[model samples]
Target: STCDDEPIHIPGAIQPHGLLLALAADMTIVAGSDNLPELTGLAIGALIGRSAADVFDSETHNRLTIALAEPGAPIAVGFTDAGFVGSWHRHDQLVFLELEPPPQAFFRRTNSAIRRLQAAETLESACAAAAQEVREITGFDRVMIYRFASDFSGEVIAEDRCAEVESYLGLHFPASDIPAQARRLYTINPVRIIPDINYRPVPVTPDLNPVTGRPIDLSFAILRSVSPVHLEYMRNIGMHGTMSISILRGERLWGLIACHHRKPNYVDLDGRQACELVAQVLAWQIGVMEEQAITRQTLKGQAIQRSLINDIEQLHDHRAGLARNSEALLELMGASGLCLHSREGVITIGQTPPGPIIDQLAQLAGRSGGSELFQTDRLSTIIPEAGAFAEVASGVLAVPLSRTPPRRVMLWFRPEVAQTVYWAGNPDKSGRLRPRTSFAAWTEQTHGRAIAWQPHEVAAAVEIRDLIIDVIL
Candidate 1:
């Protein structure tokens, strides 16, 4: 009875999910749980019939209190703030339904209601469904859900298609393709969609914002200027134009829900609104799904991890243990290959391409330092020894399994050759850029026109690891 009387039920919470509940109402804890430690500040509480501030934490109470007091979606606090607040601006249609009390009125109701409903559910299915809906709404050639890993490796989780589309269902992508720098950017801006890579960006107006009186900085999270070396790396592995929506669980990058269209297309301002509307819903859905999955897997994953670790420890050499039972190693990491090596790059276990390809891989590592590891979709860039590694092996994802203690390494390969992809430029904008030839023309034409990147750009590769790694390792 005393526990029930406590104002907080979700243990440690201050400002859950970055949303602050107002404190002025007769509040009651509705739903409270956390997926991360820092998120201890967040919780969802309800007020029987009180002001909004009654449910929020102090920080959110201040910001939201002022926000709700204002007329229009209050001036954005950040760039994404514009998109987040803008979603409420669409609830004015006759077809829309009102899902809230008055005061925040005056926009499209369907999108808001849909967004709210979507956020209330688990996050994965929401994002997957949103990808499907986006494909339907935009008619893109192929829309896929891509997920990222701690090490940058990723996978295509769910996909929707038109009749002639290709599917990379069971395939694996190298983690190096999206380097550390690139992954950091994805976290900064959660949603990125280039309707057309070649789309000419609408030049920022001379008086872009009345508040600032300067041109808007929309290039904040763009990927066109991404490490050219990395761009070449992705192209070599076969991904053309894409629109990505970052799936975020608080600050952590959960991966992405990417929409890949073989040819060029655009998500216009109006359509862009629709895309974002669906994207927010997807993010919330992913949160819900992760909550459920993590809860279900906690015990099972620990049991397996312990057993696998014990089996590998007995072998004096990490590489010998890996080579002797690659499948077991894979089972431990939940990966497809269990490659191991000594600190000096000596192979201890597992299969990798031979001859020229091996030489190329060794060469690539020469550039990054022998002790380092990363993810890659194209081996040529990382390893130039084999010009055809992207063709022969597609990509290699390696982890320095033990850098200090045993001085051994683990390298994983997604062996299938990557398909070649061509782009008309960033595919998320509302227009397409004209094609150019020769160095001079291409540079001049794409000078100011760049594309933005989103979160799911790496999702497709992370999903299948558990299933495949269990068998292959």
Candidate 2:
């Protein structure tokens, strides 16, 4: 709804659990009185998007200024405006939101909730059961166990959905969906919870973690940290908020336990600790599953690569095996399709645009050579004027395949190939970009920021590329 002065009504679509509705009209009611709820309106803009003294009203801002000047001083201001109403007495003062919860008490309550793991005998079973318990506990619509691969590719191992919601079990997600940078950072911090993807980030205290007394390393290295690219990606995928935890086994990047809530949810400190404990237990279960299944499957996959490599070596002409090789590689990887590129360009691949288009990809990479591997933004970025492979091959994962020399074969995957597409309903732009023309341009003109490809997506592309290189070389 617009913050204008009109009562707008938004007709709700049939949502899970019945009819849904919202006030979609324009309205700006900023005043409330004694009998009504007390409210105040303040005009302030953030500095470098940080929460600081001057970010609020003059009086409140002054109070912040004073508090900061004298450490340990309390900053208090009287609420003097009237624009909000509620049951509580409205103080015309600055409202403070709790930024961090105390550690000890928070963990105590949470650990207790997750202690009921006795229901399931095995870890995987327990993980599924725990997810179900969390779903019921949180009253969320859907929950799933997302097991990530070392290459960043992952699967939705277990899901307990609302009776009406569909589940994505065997379906695969593209490697481009989760970039490698995101995965390496998962070790230090194993969870990410965004209450609202669209919500503006609140500047926390001291411009760093107060507890550490040092500047926090807020980067792709921390799994719990938010990436603008990913937040946008989540919103695009139709989820309002997401809570994900990493599951590690020894040194391998195993996967994650992902829970999606279509609506906003505030999982208190107690809830967070419980989820963490449950996640730890889930990790142990994954270890067992990997021991039982993943190890053997990976070995078989490696063998397939060895065989394929020998076949490629015998080919009289490299191009002759290109198409067949691409198809065979995809099948082996359990993917919809894949593409391969060399310094010159695509030598031949399966399920992609015309030859001229991929040729252009090679041309661009050739001009930008010297980099061992080059995974790029949507294809539009490369051509920027045409539009052919944009929809199908919006992304390209170019790996050297062989670090030794003649390093050939960079792979490509389309649309992250997840069983489903996550789209954020932005009226101005389609969350998913397809080619406007066969030439595959239009990318340069689209000034919109490109979201970070997920670690899984990157890992998947690398896995396929590595498998092919091992087989043919």
Candidate 3:
């Protein structure tokens, strides 16, 4: 189903910019990268079977010991002895130590950078600000705020790019573009970079650590080689370097701050961390913005519900009350059609299916075990017989007014409006383990689905149903 079946974890090698060391409990290097000999001023033979203290000076070794004891957030302790900075983490019994040269300068103006991001009142503005800030700080050719949908498909919501490069703003990518396992890894390790996609991977010395007799886990390694399928995917897009900063909402990976470059650009340890911090700040801002929008919408819906109830109270018959306010009810849910299904028979308004089709939908909702609200964009999927009514009733939101037998439901309808979906590449094409040769936009026409109902819209429907129960029978 997904083409991302490459062995990304056991890459056995890392990028040349850094070296990896798999050490035993005694701090003795069990397996080390070949390039470590050059980077650490020791022979490959001398590096292994020796304690890290023997190679790094006393101060660096002391810090490593402290880091191993309390592994919290990613720490950058200077290793002047090895001429590198270490971003340390622990996995099982092994202490994974990755080394990178010190950054040119960690941006001192991060406070102001965060303030600018916070000042944005809307989610779109915040994402745009984040993209611009990361691109300026990292000097990458392009930066995009990539957001995930409910279906796990992603879209480039905002972008900042050099004039020479094509903009990816508003481009959509299928869920399979990033597989399930890869998404899981993003939560474990929040930041990843492919400094140079074309560079050869330097194998770890023993392939497996002698102490554990297993491959060293590079989940947090800065130099961990990426999936080969991903490499070709980058090549197809004419990108030479790339980096991703995870935008996490609590424990879940909400999205990614993706950076791309035309030439090899290795953002030093400090810069990468800075970008990560910026993403964290932006994530908070985005969450706050979304919550505020929902709050405002909820207040508006409550006002409308109160008005509808007051109008219904004046009517002689309760069912007639619903019919009188049918237009207002449809406007509240942002639905194109509305139906009040009771024992008295179904009363329909606006663009909906015929009488027989409406009866079938009411039966489907009745079978759903008396939930207060039931919503689906694919009505045809739930009832195969309803496929013929896809044009007018592709999506349905049903709110039950009563809990007892002979259930009464208020149903909202959304039509199937075919839309043009823009994908980065053809996700269904059989270009397994390699990038699709075509980089052109893959346009697709979708069917049998309606525009998704917003959370506030659903909440409004439920509230109105509750209000009807309070005022009516």
TM-score of each: 0.38, 0.39, 0.89
The digit string of per-residue lDDT tens for model 3 on 331-442 reads: 7777888877875777777777876555566666656565445778887888776789888889888776666356776788988878877977777773445457675777
lDDT of 2 by residue, 315-391 (tens): 84445654555565555444334655555655546556666545455544444355445655455666664344455
Per-prediction tally of clashes:
84, 53, 0
Ranking of models by lDDT: 3, 2, 1
> Candidate 3: which stretches are off by over 4 Å?
2-4, 40-46, 71-82, 103-108, 209-213, 342-345, 354-373, 401-408, 430-432
Residue 238 miss distance in model 3 (angstroms): 0.3
lDDT of 1 by residue, 1-473 (tens): 12113221111222111222111212222222222112233322222223334333454446543543434233222221122221122111101000111113323544554655465444444545666677766677877776665565666666777877767542334454444544665776565554334333221112122223332222232212222243343344354566676666677777666777776665533454566666566666666665655444443445544443455567644345435656554444334443444545556344456544333344434344554445665545545544454333445655433334444334566544323322322222203222112111111122111121112212222322332345345
In model 1, where do residues sit more than 4 Å from their true spots? 1-128, 131-278, 287-322, 331-337, 344-347, 353-373, 387-394, 401-407, 418-473
Each prediction's whole-model lDDT (CA):
0.43, 0.47, 0.77
Q: What is the C-alpha RMSD of each candidate to the true structure, in Å?
A: 18.1, 15.3, 3.1
